[PDB]
Amino acid sequence: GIVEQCCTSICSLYQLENYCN
């Protein structure tokens, strides 16, 4: 998940847009 990918580790613009509508 977005918590694992962007919070417990470092986020990226690439993974952030996978969560937009």
Partner 1 sequence: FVNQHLCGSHLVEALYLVCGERGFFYTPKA
Residues that bind partner 1 (CB under 8 A): 1-3, 6-13, 16-17, 19-21
Nearby residues of 11 by Cβ (< 8 Å), 6 or more positions away: 5
Of 14, 19, 21, nearest to 3 by C-alpha is 19
Smallest gap from Cβ 14 to partner 1, in A, equals: 9
Least distance from partner 1 to the Cβ atom of residue 12, Å: 6
| Shortest reach from residue 11's CB to partner 1, in Å | 5
The answer to whether the beta carbons of residues 19 and 2 sit under 8 Å apart is yes
